Each structure stands twice: as structure tokens, then as C-alpha cells.
Amino acid sequence: GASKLRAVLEKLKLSRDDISTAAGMVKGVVDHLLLRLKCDSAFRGVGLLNTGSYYEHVKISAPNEFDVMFKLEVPRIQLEEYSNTRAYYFVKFKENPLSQFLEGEILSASKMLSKFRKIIKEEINDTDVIMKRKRGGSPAVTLLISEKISVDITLALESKSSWPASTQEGLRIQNWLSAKVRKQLRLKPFYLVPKHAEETWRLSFSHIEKEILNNHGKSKTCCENKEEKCCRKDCLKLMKYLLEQLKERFKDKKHLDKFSSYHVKTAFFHVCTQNPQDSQWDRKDLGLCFDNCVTYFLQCLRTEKLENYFIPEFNLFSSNLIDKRSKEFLTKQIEYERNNEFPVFDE
């Protein structure tokens, strides 16, 4: 029931101070690294993009892990869609700081990532910060702070052009946040992160995700007063915690390894579109609202369909990305939990 769910939310608050303190340590290192990348020629125009769960106020665990995005203003970008992926692109240009990374027409993510890593390792050595390494094109590089906090740093090109055609039917917020807001948001830049699908880049809208979370009501004053305290953020925190707790019960074989907080977040945005009124997220209806989120996530698993919220034809749950057996496995676990009032949350 809602009492059990409220107890979960109270438990998550116990970790708030550890996360904030660690976030401050990350900021100290990031600020130091950023001011020295301004010295390196290739990345002089780098800037901090304050995206990610901490800045969305929904980081509820893992105080030793942070995702940080650096942006790099890149004038005059023309994109070329890679195959028919809708989310992956080659970067071209209509001097140029990134001129040294061009192979013919195409901007090489491999060459640019290589310099980025090398330049960061050079600046890092010049206090108790070093560079770890993991799997994936983005994050580009990883810092280890005080031999304790791991910061995944993503480099993202910033394009101040209009969003790609593949986003034309995405961001379906008109009945919730308004058509006015949708137009305003689409005048904002978009980002490209280096990401294998080759020298491909993937669209990123983490800045818009943060805006939609921190200004999330139909009412402009949602969550600015006691009469309009909704449970949207609480529901996202509970969905994230549900997935984290289920993953913890398979640390051995990591059967749920393919599922991520980003899947949860994407599904949550879809539920906001489906339930656009603030009265559909009343604080007193926490249990029902959480049920709405869990049942939609279940539907995504069973139908093997979870559309990227900005790029509808990019299906995060296609069997190409996540095998059917893994989705059926998570379906069985979540179904059991839901039908039993979430014993995973029992104390």
C-alpha cells in the first residue's frame, strides 16, 4: 500500500546527504578539469552541461557513481542518418577547431575521443584524481576521485540547429506541458554523443529531460505550494529503486544487466503523456500512480516496445538491443512483485 511506498521514500532520504556531499567533490574535480581543457586547443570551447539524475533531483542511490556531460559548441553541423537507425548519425560541416578530426567529409568520433582521453589524462596527472576505464564509447573517459568516486564523463557536440527529422513526432507533451512549451523546447540546442551502433554519434536530449523533470506539471506552480504537491518525482524514484533492488538480487549472474534507469525514465515520461493532468498525480494517490508506472513498464516489456521519448522510431526494447528472454525474465519478477504489494520493499 501507499504506507509501504511512503516508507520506501523516507528510507531513500537517509542517503541524501551522502549523495550531495559526493556531488560537491565531483564538482570540484570537474571544475578543475574543465578550466584546463579550456587551455587545450581542441576543446577550448568545452562547457559543463549539468544534466543527469542528481541535477534532476532523482538520484536516489550510488553516491560513488556520477554521470557528467561536457558540451562542445560545434558550429554548422549537417547530419547524415546512419542506415535507418533514426538515432545514430554521421557528423559533417556545411576554420574549424575539430578540423583535425575530419576524415574526408565525416567527423571521426574515434579520433576526437582519442584526443579527449589523452588530453584529460594529461591534465588529470597535474589532486587525488586518476583515470579508470570501462566499456563503451560514451562515456568517453572515467575519472576516479579520492580512489572512491567514479565520474563517467561524456563529451557531447552541441548543435544550435533545428532538431533532426527523426524527432518530428517525438516529445509528445502538447496535452501535458502544452504546445507552447513543446515549441520553446525545440528551439533549444540538441546534443550528439559519440556512440557505436563506425564513426557514428547518437542524439542526446538530457538537457530537455532535466527541464521536463524540474518543470513537470500542467500547472506552472506544480510543486511550488502545498495545494499542488504532486507525486511524479516520487513515482520515478520508486520505479528506479524497484529496478535497482531487483538487479541487486542477481549480482552473481546479472540477468537484468541490460536494463537501466534510462528505460525507467523513458517509460515514466510516456506515463506522464498518458496522464497529463496534475490531478492524476495527487500526492494522496501515490499507490495508484506508482501502479500506473509499473503496469506501463510491464506493457513495454511484454510488447517489446519502449520508444525513445524524443525519437519514436528508436525502440529501446527491440530484441536487437535486449533479448526476449531477458524481458520475459524481468516481466515475471515485476509481475510477482506487483501482485504481492511489492515484497521487495518489505522491511
Ligand SMILES: [Zn+2]
Ligand atoms: Zn509537481
